[PDB]
Amino acid sequence: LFLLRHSSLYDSFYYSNYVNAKLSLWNENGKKRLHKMFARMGIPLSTAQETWLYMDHSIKRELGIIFDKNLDRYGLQDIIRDGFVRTLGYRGSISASEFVEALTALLEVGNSAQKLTNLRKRWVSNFWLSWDALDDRKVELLNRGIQLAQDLQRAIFNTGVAILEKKLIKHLRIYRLCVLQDGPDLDLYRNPLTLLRLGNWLIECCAESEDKQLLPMVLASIDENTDTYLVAGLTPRYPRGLDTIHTKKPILNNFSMAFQQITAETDAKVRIDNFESSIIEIRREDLSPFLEKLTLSGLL
């Protein structure tokens, strides 16, 4: 769940990759199913939306039993897991996943060639902003990171809802394409980490579950301020929490070699400089030709 100990239970079940993938909350029927689940579990709706700290302590104590009793029915039996929790005296607890999410949020949204340099240097500064937060004397940075993580998750959820509702994910025998060209949150999708967050969100929902074949997904986002696409080549994933022989074998990501070959053949000023080869930057006028070349490559 997403920031269970720093938000409301309803929000924890709402802004979650696995929960949404299992229940497909992006449509109204998913929200109705979630409401029915909460009603069956016995937790009221007003109580479920109260912050974790101020929520009634009885339900907080009995939560594990409630989850065990009433989650098999809705298929969310893989939600339960064992994780590390670190708490300092008289201060609220925090789990490893929440700490990592806060650190990533601080890295992402915390705070011609000139714009590129400014963006990269802002990311470098955010690196140090995150570095300090990793200490026990800088709890304020941790709280700010948690708030920023909440905001980023809300924005990514909204964008994913829009994409899924409008059915922008075209399907091809080899790969799947999702190109963004408008929206209110397109500014955020310039940091590779945020774009990868959106990619993971989309991969979990209907690309790894819902009886769908596993194909690499190419996700791109425009930025009119520089006229280029932050194309990212993501790898598929097997259903979460399903141990099997095929699950043991890692799913290799073949985007790097095909990307390099296509860049070598053509000339579109592709910026292959990120350490992760999955991400490049292609000019606006040369996106569709590059996609056609990738389709013809047959190397994915």
Which residues bind to other proteins, rule: CB under 8 A? 32, 35-36, 39-45
Q: Nearest 5 degrees, angle CA 14-CA 203-CA 79?
A: 45
Minimum CB distance to other proteins smaller for 182 or for 243? 182
CB of 35 to other proteins, least distance (A): 5
Alpha helices by DSSP H, listed for 172-286, are: 192-204, 245-248, 255-265
CB of 40 to other proteins, least distance (A): 5
* CA distances from residue 276 to 106, 176, 207, 216, 233 in whole angstroms, order as listed: 20, 20, 22, 16, 10
Minimum CB distance to other proteins smaller for 59 or for 169? 59
CB of 39 to other proteins, least distance (A): 4
Minimum CB distance to other proteins smaller for 42 or for 92? 42
Minimum CB distance to other proteins smaller for 27 or for 93? 27
Minimum CB distance to other proteins smaller for 43 or for 203? 43
CB of 166 to other proteins, least distance (A): 13
CB of 45 to other proteins, least distance (A): 5
Please report, as a single letter, which amino acid is at residue 98: E
Q: Which two tokens stand for residue 35?
A: 């409401």
Q: Would you give the DSSP letter of residue 259?
A: H
Minimum CB distance to other proteins smaller for 10 or for 290? 10
**Distance between CA atoms of residues 114 and 263, nearest Å:** 24
**Distance between CA atoms of residues 259 and 217, nearest Å:** 13
**Distance between CA atoms of residues 219 and 132, nearest Å:** 32
CB of 65 to other proteins, least distance (A): 11
Looking up tokens 């009603």 gives: 39
Cβ-in-10-Å burial (0-12, 13-18, 19+) of 162 comes to middle
Minimum CB distance to other proteins smaller for 86 or for 167? 167
CB of 285 to other proteins, least distance (A): 20
Please report, as a single letter, which amino acid is at residue 223: D
**Distance between CA atoms of residues 109 and 185, nearest Å:** 12
Minimum CB distance to other proteins smaller for 66 or for 193? 66
Q: Would you give the DSSP letter of residue 290?
A: H
**Distance between CA atoms of residues 200 and 7, nearest Å:** 22
CB of 60 to other proteins, least distance (A): 14
**Distance between CA atoms of residues 34 and 72, nearest Å:** 14
User: 292 CB contacts (<8 Å, ≥6 apart)?
Assistant: none
